[PDB]
From a paper:
Cp assembles into icosahedral 90-dimer T = 3 capsids and 120-dimer T = 4 capsids. Putative Cp allosteric effectors (e.g. heteraryldihydropyrmidines or HAPs) have been discovered that have antiviral effect. These small molecules ostensibly act by inducing an assembly-active state and by stabilizing Cp-Cp interactions by filling a pocket at the interdimer interface between dimers of the quasi-sixfold.
To examine HAP-bound capsids, we reconstructed T = 4 and T = 3 Cp150-HAP-TAMRA capsids to 4.0 Å and 3.7 Å resolution, respectively, from a single dataset. In T = 4 capsids, quasi-sixfold hexamers have four HAP-TAMRA molecules, while the T = 3 quasi-sixfold hexamers accommodate three HAP-TAMRA molecules. In the T = 4 quasi-sixfold, the HAPs are in B, C, B’, and C’ pockets, which are respectively capped by C, D, C’ and D’ subunits. No small molecule density was observed at the corresponding A (fivefold) and D sites, which are occluded by A and B subunits, respectively. Furthermore, the structure of the T = 4 capsid suggests interaction only between probes in the B and C’ or C and B’ sites. The structural differences between the HAP-bound T = 4 particle and an apo-capsid are evident when capsids are aligned based on icosahedral symmetry. It is immediately clear that the HAP-bound particle has expanded, particularly at the fivefold. In comparison to the apo capsid, the displacement maximum is almost 6 Å around the 5-fold axis, and the displacement minimum is 1.7 Å around the 3-fold axis. The two-dimer asymmetric unit is rotated along the long axis of the CD dimer, near the 3-fold, leading the AB dimer to pivot upward, raising at the 5-fold. The T = 4 Cp150+HAP TAMRA cryo-EM structure has a larger diameter than crystallographic structures of the apo capsid and CpAM-bound capsids.
Numbering used by the authors:
A (entry chain B), B (entry chain A), C (entry chain A), D (entry chain B), E (entry chain C), F (entry chain D): 1 to 142
The structure:
Amino acid sequence: MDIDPYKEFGATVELLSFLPSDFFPSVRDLLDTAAALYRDALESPEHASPHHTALRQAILAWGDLMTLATWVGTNLEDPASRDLVVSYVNTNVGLKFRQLLWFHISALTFGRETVLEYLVSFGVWIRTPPAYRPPNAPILST
Amino acid sequence: MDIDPYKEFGATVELLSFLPSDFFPSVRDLLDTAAALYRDALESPEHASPHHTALRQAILAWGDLMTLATWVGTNLEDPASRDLVVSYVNTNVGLKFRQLLWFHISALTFGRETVLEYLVSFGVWIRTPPAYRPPNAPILST
Amino acid sequence: MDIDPYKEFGATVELLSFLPSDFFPSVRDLLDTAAALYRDALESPEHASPHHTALRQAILAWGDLMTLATWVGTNLEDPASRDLVVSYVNTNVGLKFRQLLWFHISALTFGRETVLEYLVSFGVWIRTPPAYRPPNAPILST
Amino acid sequence: MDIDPYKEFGATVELLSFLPSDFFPSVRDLLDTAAALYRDALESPEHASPHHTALRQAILAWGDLMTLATWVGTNLEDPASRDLVVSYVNTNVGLKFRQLLWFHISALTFGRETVLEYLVSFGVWIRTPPAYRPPNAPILST
Amino acid sequence: MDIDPYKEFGATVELLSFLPSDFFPSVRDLLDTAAALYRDALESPEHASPHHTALRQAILAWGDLMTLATWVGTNLEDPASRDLVVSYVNTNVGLKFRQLLWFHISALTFGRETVLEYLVSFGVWIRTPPAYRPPNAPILST
Amino acid sequence: MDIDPYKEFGATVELLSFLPSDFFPSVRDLLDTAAALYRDALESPEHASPHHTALRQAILAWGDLMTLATWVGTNLEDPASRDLVVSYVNTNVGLKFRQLLWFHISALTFGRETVLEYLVSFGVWIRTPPAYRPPNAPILST
Ligand SMILES: COC(=O)c1c(CN2CCN(C(=O)CCCNC(=O)c3ccc(C(=O)[O-])c(-c4c5ccc(=[N+](C)C)cc-5oc5cc(N(C)C)ccc45)c3)CC2)nc(-c2ccccn2)nc1-c1ccc(F)cc1Cl
Ligand SMILES: COC(=O)c1c(CN2CCN(C(=O)CCCNC(=O)c3ccc(C(=O)[O-])c(-c4c5ccc(=[N+](C)C)cc-5oc5cc(N(C)C)ccc45)c3)CC2)nc(-c2ccccn2)nc1-c1ccc(F)cc1Cl
Ligand SMILES: COC(=O)c1c(CN2CCN(C(=O)CCCNC(=O)c3ccc(C(=O)[O-])c(-c4c5ccc(=[N+](C)C)cc-5oc5cc(N(C)C)ccc45)c3)CC2)nc(-c2ccccn2)nc1-c1ccc(F)cc1Cl
């Protein structure tokens, strides 16, 4: 039934609510990072962590919708519909994969612990009111 | 990069091409089967096998396209060309998910070796000349 | 000298005569099956079994006749009598290759003993009087 | 897919490009050599090297096309077509088997090493320009 | 054949396309820089590390092109050192030598690990959102 | 700035100029012989030897000038320019590459000592008067 990817990873789906929209880099940058620094283990036919499994499984989904967005700009003679659909692709759909792809890439580099710790210390950051807040946003580190 | 769905789990996308599209059961069916069997592996925060860890994504990935069918269902003016898309969503873009679900369900329920041993077997049957050919079909045991 | 194709691999050309020509799947089919299964044994420069080492030759041997069909396809004036030849190429001269491919594919995929154990079995079925005779057909397991 | 016989033998198909057309003896001499000095292991139902496997598998192909050339001179009432076809049989088709049969026969007698070494030292021979070239062509030796 | 110059160096041509073109200093700076630190090593008769080997061949490969464009300045008017020759050499082909020279000059200075790390450790810093990142890029330490 | 391309290997430009001009085979032949002999080490992501490193960079250098030979074929319309310019890459500068390609290739297969001896021998052989020079040129040795 209703399942959260973060369940087995010590996280939650509501945990990403604290992260604003622009917190996540663009999807193009998302794939390119994994396509640059992780290409070995991804196409490697022998995974080592579950993140490698979900990641290469997740990249196919986004690569899947890309063909969808390509076809939509092929047979839909309603430019308003092709606008909203293609826009909605980069919208919450794309914003969903961003919330997912970013985690695993952040997961593989730092583990599944510091990414939690950062998201822990980030939400408390944005939790704090404006004036009494450390203006330098917390940096993802190790 | 060019990640492929089925490399570390034995079979590959070249292998599944034997099975015609008509063999794959409807996505409405599979979503209950391994789910009605598995209220735990699809919900426990402690993984057991990469299959359901890979299965969760298509689960999440399916509802997204379903959410797209939901979102598109009202927020588009012309349902005529729209349903042309929703047909494309269920038929084609769901066909790939129809295979991703069918693998891990049968695999997780019958061991990975059985599905590989069955994939080769059915392709043998499908390529045998139908002039005389056994009317048998998928066996699946433990 | 009078070399025979099937001496060291168990079965012999006298044995394969049980199988009528209609049983053998089309060469268009077999060329993908063991190839789609085997991107390595058909490409690795380090052999494993003599089958694919024997299989490569018919692969090369097939394209030659196919190259002959290609070369003949334009460099002959009358395609009427020409296609009489190209029919003879695919039908008869390809029939022998149709058997050479079918053996090693099934043999390399199911062990040499299974095909020998299956060859005798089918001949038993083919010679049983069809007045009452099992409607079964090639089994193939491990 | 596209496969080279020389892949598992430390050679390549492009390696034979250095060898001119007349480098290879006629096919009749090719079979007769194997039909004279190797008849024991060829019809022997227990091979000892992969060359014995590919060789007896290769001889059948050429023996196969011979029946083809025989039939072509039986029902094709176009003498130009029977000319070009039969000529093309002895052409690059036959020149292909010559490149193959010669290697294995040369392989079995000297191993799969000196035949490479010779073809290594032969191409460098023909690589050298005319005037500054050792006029005595390199001899296949042991 | 296809020989990426970074194969025996860890990095690949695709990892280096992960950085913007402006990331690489100008061509003349690298020549003067390398010629301002390794006159004692480049023109030395004996090489210590392979970077000296690749770098020496890298520079002379550049001097030929500059020598090339110079000679082209006396052939014709537009497509000779004016419209296409010096434009293509100085602009297009320069983009790949800028990284060849930069990598080795960067490498031997700080080893090969550090140059491999800095690419990734920088190439994502340019991808991180503006607000949630440090103000200045990282720096090659050791 | 003027770095010896050969100073690492004892020989200098005078020695390869010490031999005649057309003694060096055509550019494509070396790449043929280079690809045939050393298809594996040049693809290998491991530092085989100093010759391999320079040989890879040597080929990629030629790979670029051939690209400009291809670029001029398309984005250059003046036949007086496109033809004459190719005479610089294909004819004028190719000699400078054939010296490198012939040296590094030969040194690998034989050894840096023998190639230097072979330079002196064939360098003095050609200068000996024709009336009393030995019959054949000196031989490549081990
Ligand atoms: C996983 O890797 C990534 O790719 C990655 C990372 C991680 N990267 C790591 C590298 N990185 C660097 O910056 C380099 C390290 C050096 N930096 C430093 O040392 C550094 C950086 C900032 C500060 C900072 O301002 O306070 C300081 C700093 C201090 C640090 C520690 C400290 N004490 C003692 C404890 C005291 C400090 O006192 C200071 C005092 C200052 N005054 C003078 C006022 C000023 C500064 C400081 C140091 C940026 C983050 N994050 C994120 C991300 C994106 C959006 C939102 C949140 N997170 N996304 C990705 C990602 C992106 C795309 C993609 F596809 C995939 C991925 Cl996964
Ligand atoms: C595998 O077997 C085969 O069947 C076979 C062979 C091998 N055979 C072996 C037997 N064979 C002989 O000749 C007998 C051996 C005795 N010969 C010698 O001693 C001999 C032969 C030639 C020379 C030669 O001219 O330089 C020399 C010679 C020297 C030798 C070594 C030497 N030092 C110290 C290192 C110094 C030398 O200084 C000389 C100096 C000279 N001055 C006075 C100028 C003159 C000569 C020499 C010696 C010929 C080759 N080759 C080829 C082949 C065909 C085409 C193209 C290339 N290759 N095809 C086949 C095949 C065919 C069909 C078939 F269906 C299947 C097969 Cl496989
Ligand atoms: C050989 O490689 C290269 O040439 C190279 C490099 C290497 N880079 C170059 C730049 N570089 C530096 O800048 C030095 C570090 C700067 N350090 C700091 O700023 C720094 C960091 C921390 C502190 C700190 O303790 O608080 C301080 C510091 C102070 C800071 C501010 C200050 N107040 C208030 C005014 C007072 C300070 O008082 C101090 C006092 C101290 N005491 C008393 C002991 C000690 C420290 C400090 C400074 C060295 C490394 N990069 C790049 C490149 C390319 C693209 C993009 C980015 N980069 N390309 C190349 C390349 C180019 C072309 C070519 F052909 C080939 C190559 Cl390879």
